[PDB]
Write a protein that binds this ligand. Structure first.
Ligand SMILES: Nc1ncnc2c1ncn2[C@@H]1O[C@H](COP(=O)(O)OP(=O)(O)O)[C@@H](O)[C@H]1O
Lengths: 288, 216, 72, 144, 72, 72
């Protein structure tokens, strides 16, 4: 009975704003409710979602704190939930892909496959939760991001390089509150939209480039993502729900170790990439 | 930090960690004007949030690396985190909250004591931890480090090391006063065994001799 | 005639939305009042909490400061 | 530095201690202009604000350890704090008004006199505290 | 610096002292433009407002301790 | 009485500038509607611009958000 009477009410609101807009005038709510009908999502996420659907039925033009509800629902309704690519972690299939997408570089491929084998076997306690996360160091001009692509297509995942390098704060790694003029999601949440699954790889570029201003340094929200005992517990200012980042796998490149913060140095092993020889350079130049 | 955790679970109390020393800016405990939505951007009320109860045990890593001299001094940016006669109402002197800290048990962690501001040093007393001998490193590697590394690598009863291998690893692959570098080496041996398992598995156990340490 | 029609329909729909609202709609005002009154609490921070609540009761939306006082 | 507290308690007055060691900037004796962001008064107005009276006892520890590099010279801003004829009109840069510091009891400590710059040593009265014999050390350890 | 106040009392002029020791900000002599938020004129215009007369005695004290090369 | 008078002034002005700005209505809005279509702008931004124009067409002119929309 209360449903039928509130159906009376909702249709009334429809008819009136239909008269005011010169068009449905509420086409936005009719689109967004059908958007909430999608794959997923958890119920506390939808309970946070349903509060701002029903606030733009008060004002339509403006405000700088009402249009943000439209932008926020449009941004919330497009993250991947529960879409798994066919994983494969085979030490005789990844080895072929790595030995085709590059030349030489035996020892670094071997030390990658070791990490891959332990990524494979540990499906019980601490699936990577005390396994140190991977970083690659070396001069410029050696193949590093090409190894990120050569690993990412060897698991059928999505490669999506995310680059800091010029950070001023950790308040851009984490997003910002939607009710301000600045309404932006994480660099990582945008980065999450760009893929088609829930478990891509995300490479990180020159992580030894940090901040000194906007008081602080981004070694405090960065560790909250890189630690697999923390990334499932990740919360952003923009979405304000816990979004799972445990199933993704990270690769990182830096150029020097001697300016990376110690809570991050205690979470990683290093594969020093040496530099090439003249016959290695000649083979790379002829092939690729 | 492990000794601090041991003290914390010895008293059935909580444990929480607050890092310092990475303060390139001077006053991040402070407690300056509103770039934060709240009267405390410092670490202390956030740590009091993360602990659910009134009386935690809090550690402070590297209170002696507040030597930056960038738009102010981080050494000059601390007196009143502790010192329980003023600490009944907490202050940052510029943007603070009056809140009780007279039930929290504080520990402090430093590397070199010659950098602390002198009003803070004379309030505290010191415990000095020297450094390990190689027999201490071998005993720690047998009793604590090697089981933990073969657990979390998923091998746990199909590969073993001997004492000669432990002593060879310590003498020829580490130069340190602690045990942090030895732990990575034991982890490398475990993950090497993992790749050899997944590339053709054997039966039973294989003990790793002193000759096979270059092979791993 | 069009202006008077606009004002009547405008506040008619807003009154409909108010009626479609029970318990002040979601009503985070009484929610944070219950979040005050059920925990702790000392006395000067009682005054600080009630004055921040009263700063939240006057302005409702449009300024950043309303959400600032909410979070604060 | 304990004798400062005993002197302040012995005269029923207020005590506050300022540690000048490692002070490398003159922007924390006198403040900044209120046109910047940041922009708070110097340590002396903080000290006078904690205390609620105009004649406290302020202790300034280790005045021989202020520095003079590129970072600055805080010893040039002290010359108007400690000037006994001219500190009745002290202006920092945050408060634009002259403020009267002629009633406060400055006590200063140092270990040697050779590192205080001479126009600043000229304002201060010197009392040398000698150091103890073994009989004095026995007496101190027995009854204090 | 005693002769400053003695000379100004002698000639029946007004008096104002500016202490220049350790000042290393150029915007203490001139001001900032009135585009900035808390902007206001320098020490000279401020002293001339305090005096209130076109004809004072200004003591620019310890002018050889003006620090250089930080902002300017 | 004065402010209702000034409202009346602006609405009689609005009627006259309906009766001269365009034969049926503000004709520069229709000139914008043609000019948006003539320039080869991409389809997403054309949907954006036509949405802004349709919202602008119901604002009253001489308004601090009509000018923002028309300048955009
Ligand atoms: N076998 C190889 N080793 C290294 N680089 C290679 C190889 N084959 C091709 N390249 C090319 O060399 C370039 C080096 O660039 P990049 O890897 O971005 O350098 P860096 O990672 O040091 O910034 C890549 O664009 C890659 O296409």
């Amino acid at each position: 009975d209360t449903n039928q009477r509130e159906y009376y009410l909702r249709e009334q609101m429809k008819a009136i704003q239909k008269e005011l807009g010169g068009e449905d005038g509420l086409s936005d709510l009719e689109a967004l409710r059908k958007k909430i009908e999608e794959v997923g999502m958890p119920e506390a996420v939808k309970t946070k979602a349903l509060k701002e659907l029903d606030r733009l039925e008060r004002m339509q033009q403006g405000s700088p704190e009402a249009t943000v509800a439209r932008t926020y629902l449009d941004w919330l309704t497009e993250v991947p939930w529960s879409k798994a690519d066919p994983e494969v972690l085979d030490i005789n299939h990844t080895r072929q892909v790595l030995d085709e997408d590059h030349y030489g570089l035996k020892d670094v491929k071997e030390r990658i496959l070791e990490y891959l084998a332990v990524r494979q076997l540990t499906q019980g306690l601490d699936v990577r939760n005390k396994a140190p996360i991977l970083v690659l160091v070396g001069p410029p001009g050696v193949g590093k991001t090409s190894l990120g692509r050569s690993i990412a297509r060897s698991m059928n995942r999505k490669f999506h390089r995310i680059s800091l390098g010029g950070v001023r704060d950790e308040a851009e790694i984490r997003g910002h509150r939607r009710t301000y003029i600045g309404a932006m999601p994480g660099k990582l949440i945008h980065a999450m939209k760009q893929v088609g699954v829930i478990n891509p790889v995300i490479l990180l570029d020159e992580i030894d480039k940090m901040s000194s201003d906007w008081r602080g340094d981004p070694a405090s929200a960065m560790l909250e993502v890189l630690d697999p005992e923390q990334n499932n517990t990740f919360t952003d200012h923009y979405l304000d729900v816990p979004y799972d980042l445990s199933k993704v796998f990270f690769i990182t490149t830096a150029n020097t170790l001697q300016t990376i913060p110690r809570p991050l140095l205690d979470r990683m092993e290093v594969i020093e990439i040496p530099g090439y020889t003249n016959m290695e350079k000649q083979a790379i130049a002829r092939q690729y | 930090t492990s000794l601090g955790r041991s003290i914390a679970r010895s008293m059935n109390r909580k444990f929480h960690r607050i890092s310092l020393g990475g303060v390139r800016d001077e006053a991040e405990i402070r407690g300056h004007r509103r770039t934060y939505i709240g009267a405390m951007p410092g670490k202390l009320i956030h740590a009091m949030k993360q602990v659910g109860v009134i009386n935690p045990v809090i550690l402070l890593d590297e209170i002696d690396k507040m030597s930056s001299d960038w738009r102010g001094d981080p050494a000059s940016a601390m007196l009143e985190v502790l010192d329980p006669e003023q600490n009944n109402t907490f202050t940052d002197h510029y943007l603070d909250v009056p809140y009780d800290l007279s039930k929290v048990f504080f520990i402090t962690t430093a590397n070199t004591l010659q950098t602390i501001p002198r009003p803070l040093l004379d309030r505290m007393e010191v415990i000095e931890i020297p450094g390990y001998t190689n027999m201490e490193k071998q005993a720690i590697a047998r009793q604590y480090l090697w089981p933990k590394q073969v657990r979390e690598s998923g091998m746990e009863g199909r590969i073993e090391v001997t004492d000669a291998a432990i002593l060879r690893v310590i003498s020829e692959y580490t130069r340190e006063a602690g045990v942090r570098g030895l732990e990575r080496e034991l982890g490398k041996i475990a993950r090497k065994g993992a790749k050899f398992w997944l590339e053709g598995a054997w039966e039973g156990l294989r003990t790793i001799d002193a000759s096979d340490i270059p092979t791993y």
